[PDB]
Amino acid sequence: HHPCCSNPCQNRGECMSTGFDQYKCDCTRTGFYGENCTTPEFLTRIKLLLKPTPNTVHYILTHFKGVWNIVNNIPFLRSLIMKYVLTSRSYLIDSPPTYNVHYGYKSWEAFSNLSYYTRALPPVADDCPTPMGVKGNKELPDSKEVLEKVLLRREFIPDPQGSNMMFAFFAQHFTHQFFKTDHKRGPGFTRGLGHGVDLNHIYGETLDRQHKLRLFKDGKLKYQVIGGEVYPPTVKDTQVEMIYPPHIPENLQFAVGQEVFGLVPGLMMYATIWLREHNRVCDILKQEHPEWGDEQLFQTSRLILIGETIKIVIEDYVQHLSGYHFKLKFDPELLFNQQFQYQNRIASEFNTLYHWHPLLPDTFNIEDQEYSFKQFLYNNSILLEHGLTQFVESFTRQIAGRVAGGRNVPIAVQAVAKASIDQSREMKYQSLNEYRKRFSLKPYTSFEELTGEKEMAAELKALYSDIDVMELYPALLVEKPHPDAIFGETMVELGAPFSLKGLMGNPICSPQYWKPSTFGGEVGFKIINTASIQSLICNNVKGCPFTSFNV
Amino acid sequence: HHPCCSNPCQNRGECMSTGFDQYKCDCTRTGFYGENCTTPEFLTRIKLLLKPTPNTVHYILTHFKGVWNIVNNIPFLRSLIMKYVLTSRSYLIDSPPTYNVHYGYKSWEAFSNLSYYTRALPPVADDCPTPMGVKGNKELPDSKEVLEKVLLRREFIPDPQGSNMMFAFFAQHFTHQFFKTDHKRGPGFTRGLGHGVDLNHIYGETLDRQHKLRLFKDGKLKYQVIGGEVYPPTVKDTQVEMIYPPHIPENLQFAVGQEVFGLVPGLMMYATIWLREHNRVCDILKQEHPEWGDEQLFQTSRLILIGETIKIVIEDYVQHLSGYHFKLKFDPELLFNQQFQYQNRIASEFNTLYHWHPLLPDTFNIEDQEYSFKQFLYNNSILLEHGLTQFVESFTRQIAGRVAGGRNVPIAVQAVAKASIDQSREMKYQSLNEYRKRFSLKPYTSFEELTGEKEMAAELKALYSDIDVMELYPALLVEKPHPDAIFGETMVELGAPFSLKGLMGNPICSPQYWKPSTFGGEVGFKIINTASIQSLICNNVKGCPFTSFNV
Numbered sequence A, B: 001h002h003p004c005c006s007n008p009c010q011n012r013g014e015c016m017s018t019g020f021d022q023y024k025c026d027c028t029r030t031g032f033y034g035e036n037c038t039t040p041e042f043l044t045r046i047k048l049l050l051k052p053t054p055n056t057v058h059y060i061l062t063h064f065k066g067v068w069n070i071v072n073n074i075p076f077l078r079s080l081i082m083k084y085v086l087t088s089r090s091y092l093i094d095s096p097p098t099y100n101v102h103y104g105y106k107s108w109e110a111f112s113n114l115s116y117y118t119r120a121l122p123p124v125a126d127d128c129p130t131p132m133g134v135k136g137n138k139e140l141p142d143s144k145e146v147l148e149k150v151l152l153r154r155e156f157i158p159d160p161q162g163s164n165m166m167f168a169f170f171a172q173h174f175t176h177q178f179f180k181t182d183h184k185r186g187p188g189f190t191r192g193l194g195h196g197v198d199l200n201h202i203y204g205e206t207l208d209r210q211h212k213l214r215l216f217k218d219g220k221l222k223y224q225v226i227g228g229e230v231y232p233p234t235v236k237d238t239q240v241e242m243i244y245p246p247h248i249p250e251n252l253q254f255a256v257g258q259e260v261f262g263l264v265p266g267l268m269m270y271a272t273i274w275l276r277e278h279n280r281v282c283d284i285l286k287q288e289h290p291e292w293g294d295e296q297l298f299q300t301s302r303l304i305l306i307g308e309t310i311k312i313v314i315e316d317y318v319q320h321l322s323g324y325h326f327k328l329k330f331d332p333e334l335l336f337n338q339q340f341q342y343q344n345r346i347a348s349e350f351n352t353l354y355h356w357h358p359l360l361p362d363t364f365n366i367e368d369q370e371y372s373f374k375q376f377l378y379n380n381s382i383l384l385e386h387g388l389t390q391f392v393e394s395f396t397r398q399i400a401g402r403v404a405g406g407r408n409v410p411i412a413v414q415a416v417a418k419a420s421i422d423q424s425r426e427m428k429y430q431s432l433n434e435y436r437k438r439f440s441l442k443p444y445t446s447f448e449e450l451t452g453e454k455e456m457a458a459e460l461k462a463l464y465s466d467i468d469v470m471e472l473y474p475a476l477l478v479e480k481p482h483p484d485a486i487f488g489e490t491m492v493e494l495g496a497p498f499s500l501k502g503l504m505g506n507p508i509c510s511p512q513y514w515k516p517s518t519f520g521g522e523v524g525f526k527i528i529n530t531a532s533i534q535s536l537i538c539n540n541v542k543g544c545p546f547t548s549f550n551v
Ligand code: COH
Pocket: A168, A169, A171, A172, A175, A179, A180, A181, A264, A266, A351, A354, A355, A356, A357, A359, A360, A413, A416, A419
């Protein structure tokens, strides 16, 4: 078998076979040496003695509310802290990207082929004696048994952090610009070739699709007016291909950037809000620049919406998830005297960890109605009937499920949760503990340490035998959550660096783009710098209902 | 007409219209303020006073051989100076890239559409009152007149720097991996989507093409053996599309990575040399890793060849071009504590300035034969008759033509030179002095200052009237050369920053790639770090003939 099956190299050292039975570890720039790169260099000793744990940094940020109140009101210090938040997470992600599902070693093919998701850890070799390498049993536990024992929802568990349905649907809408698995090719492949926040879910992935969605007047996107309200145009009008069941009538087949957004009225809500926003920004730009043509109005509006999106994701969305008392800041300038790569490649593990189906409720509560999954799926009538104002009011009110803590996956989507495990295995993911070490965390020594609890730990020990063969995805869903939090430590420590890179990596955050002239001057720049989830809703939804990401 | 037609913004300020008749300059991070970014900040006023001119720096680097002899032999000093050399340029190229032929303002379409060449300066707006903005006559001079008066070769002018045909054909082969204009779409479009040193001219732009060229045994490329000599395989055997006129014998229809390489036996010489090198690197790696498959052998060899290419381009090719007494070094480690983006986008102006058709001789002298263009074009028969050994010996001995200094473009390729001019105009290039200002050079004040002479200066003045509307491409070919040099100041100052970025930007230069394990261990790594144009020929050409880029 492959000599590297046992994952012998530690601390980011690269394994390489040196014969049928032998390996070598490349220890370059890791700060360690020896056969397995475990012997610390002197300066590394001093850094390991000094640097605080992830769980210490997290306490400070989630406590001392009174001190953060001082810090948040002093611009110099807020900037300084935000700088730290950005740069600490930096060295964790390979940029330029490295491995993918087919390449456990660097190659030009892996670098150059954008159809692949990248990989934070190489896949387990095809010939390894166990699924995880050398440890554990010959087969992993049946995914069905794993799902049923510790993942599936008994009683609904509300998110103690107070996440609402505006948050769950925003998460779904936002992330589906860059998680677009190409099922024709396989789970390690993506159709999101821009690899980040390019708003293709509004504008289309291809220029052909963008042009069918565009009005070609005033920079705008096509739309229709139903009962005085602006909604996306139809499939029959744009000739834009969308995914709908056969029985969905012509008038209810809305056409938007991302082919799947007719699945859920929650997604169509956000699709409508953002289409309105784009056309709203066109109106503003036209006032500032009566001399501009359609193409410049369109392109400039797009850039402004990319900035709004990054702004919102950091300052409302990430802010809410973090539970930090410190006020996060979207300021590209903080990175201007740092080493940082303005480029991104979406990691497969970023997709996997983002399978937050526990967020979904048992029913979808809009006004006085309580819709089942059967009723909610593919029903845009629900949207037209109630209206966007009622959708926002209702979803702002309705609490989401806890993600970590185990047993919170709604039964309606059990097939989807099983697929994340199966697909995880098909893509040959390494173990939870391998991923924890890759992200500077101590491996878990037992299932009890992982769950924080006794009953689930025992199911898992009976299923997996060894903690070092526990899989990443189920673990994220069963993990001991932070105190009163939606997530546990592994989700946060893996998620945040991937997030930082997708957000700050965007070319609009680079010095040559981050100028008022890129956005049509000071007014356009200001739209970016004052954007929020509330203003997005307020500016585009009748009656300006109150909103946020918590109940 | 567009209010930015006159190009009022200086010092890299950005121009933006604010109404039909007004503009605003964006001076962010330029070091200047005021209406056209012409007033220097205090620190800028100081930076200017002290910073040496490019001609001063050029003089220092081409004199004091006795000091450079010391510096070249003290590794620490050599690295310091090279670090300066690499970082002085840097800040001159927009990366992430910005403009293109269709976008004179930043847009997502320009950022993301890899089919375009990028642009160091935005195009002149379509509605400007004169071809170059507002200066000059309503029509530029007839391109045939410019070509005939100041470009076409009367007597052959030899390169006073001693460049040979090994150099000339090296330039053509190397640059045709990234200058691959998509004539189906227009001059501003490329088929080289990898945008740099990917070695697609050897391996193919697409996976379909690569797979047809590969042997699928031991990582190797397919080949044929004619008279005991290894040559590229045929169109018939591989089903690889090549450009050949109908009359070419089947076995002389060689198939290689780049479709136009059958055009010149000169190019097919290097295609054969590099094909040999790849299969040779396979043999070494197979010996090191008898446990590896064909796929890993191929990919690792590819990475090694990319490293070899960059190494040779810096230390032999650029070294020779530069005229420096200082020895340039290929060492990615020098940028690890620097700010630098590991990405590149090929600029249209880099393509334009690289039209060095004056390098070409009047005849091609191999052994005792003198070949005319008509005889040499498409004649791989010449290659087989004489052999690679005689090709190298002959090409090492034959002098190339001077590029600047005027009147040295061979009439055999007059259509190509005319096209360079016509295409510049179709792509709406800004004028020479606009390009000089973009690259930190004083604009030329007269045609006599540009040429250093009187006769061409007078023809150019009668043709163009104003120096401020002189065009880039003809200017590079008539420019007064550096003392006893092949080029003028404008070629070096524009060319060098584009080069750095295309060489150091490559992902193999990034800290996560620049490790022995990336190249299959110390043995792969050392092939890169000891590569030279002499070693390339020595290892792959029968009899190990002496070679170099100068006669
Ligand atoms: C971020 C939170 C989130 C939410 C709230 C959410 C809400 C919902 C929802 C109710 C609104 C339904 C009916 C579904 C149903 C699905 N989801 Co999500 N999904 C979410 C994150 C994801 C992600 C990420 C993927 C992977 C998408 C991809 O790769 O294309 C996904 C994939 C899926 C798939 C395809 C899985 C497969 O077979 O490969 C289905 C079906 N699901 N999801």
